[PDB]
């Protein structure tokens, strides 16, 4: 299926003394592969997946230099934005950045993205065509003009369509044993009685990868959303994911209800029933 490489960056200003806290993480699909934390001792980009350890010293030196350059841009940004928004030096503020590329089943470029937020709000984002910018307010508009004059979008477009795609392809091959493997959900159902007349059925999906999944209930073969609760998909902590969906039913009628599971690791969707 499709694949992605995405980088996430957060800087949080520290008004009283010193530079912002800066944290960078890189992912291929739902797998973290590198990190940098300004509070950590190494001051280096660090591996977080065994397949990236294949890369040599030049890689790690080059990624470290770039990630530090990213951190300094964020530091300057935090000051500029405090200026744009007429804010004091007293409060803590945040910038967040995400960028990366998607490829389809044929591993060719599909989509690129680059977006930026200040204090959790949209600030500026590259449009889908990778040629222009969406600026949310007049501050972002001043940035847009600055980036247009300096042809920032052209530089980014080249990276997103070229380097990003090339290196995603490289990682996919080097990490093939895990990155190109699907882990189908391990499913089961649990039962609880709330009272003499009400029951809860909970449909579980565990140990799956990638994170994308659909769990739904049917009653007598028709979709049931009322009286259901669906939790957010959550990391197990070993690289796989978990999710459940529950339905409340009259006691004795459990057999009308079926759980349906869709996942790329399942060639056809699965059905579960109580008992």
């Amino acid at each position: 299926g499709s694949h992605s490489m995405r980088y996430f960056f957060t800087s949080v200003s520290r008004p009283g003394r010193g530079e912002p806290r800066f944290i960078a993480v890189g992912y291929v699909d739902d797998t973290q592969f590198v990190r940098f934390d300004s509070d950590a001792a190494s001051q280096r980009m660090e591996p977080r997946a065994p397949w990236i350890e294949q890369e040599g010293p030049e890689y790690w030196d080059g990624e470290t230099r770039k990630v530090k350059a990213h951190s300094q841009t964020h530091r300057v940004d935090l000051g500029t934005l405090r200026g744009y928004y007429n804010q004091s030096e007293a409060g803590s503020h945040t910038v967040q950045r995400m960028y990366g590329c998607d490829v389809g089943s044929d591993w060719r470029f599909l989509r690129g993205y680059h977006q930026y937020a200040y204090d959790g709000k949209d600030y500026i984002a590259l449009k889908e065509d990778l040629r222009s910018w969406t600026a949310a307010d007049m501050a972002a508009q001043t940035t847009k003009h600055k980036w247009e004059a300096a042809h920032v979008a052209e530089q980014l477009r080249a990276y997103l369509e070229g380097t990003c795609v090339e290196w995603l392809r490289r990682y996919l091959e080097n990490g093939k044993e895990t990155l190109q493997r699907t882990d189908a959900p391990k499913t089961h159902m649990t039962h609880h009685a709330v009272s003499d007349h009400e029951a809860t059925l909970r449909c579980w999906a565990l140990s799956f990868y990638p994170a994308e999944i659909t769990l739904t209930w049917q009653r007598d073969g028709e979709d049931q959303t009322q009286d259901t609760e669906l939790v957010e998909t959550r990391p197990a902590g070993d690289g796989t994911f978990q999710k459940w969906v529950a339905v409340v039913v009259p006691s004795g009628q459990e057999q009308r209800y079926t759980c349906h599971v869709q996942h790329e690791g399942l060639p056809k969707p699965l059905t579960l029933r109580w008992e």
């Binding site: 980088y7 990624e63 940035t143 600055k146």
Partner: peptide, 9 residues
Amino acid sequence: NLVPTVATV
């Protein structure tokens, strides 16, 4: 592989 340069706002 990170983008080579990042423009300031």
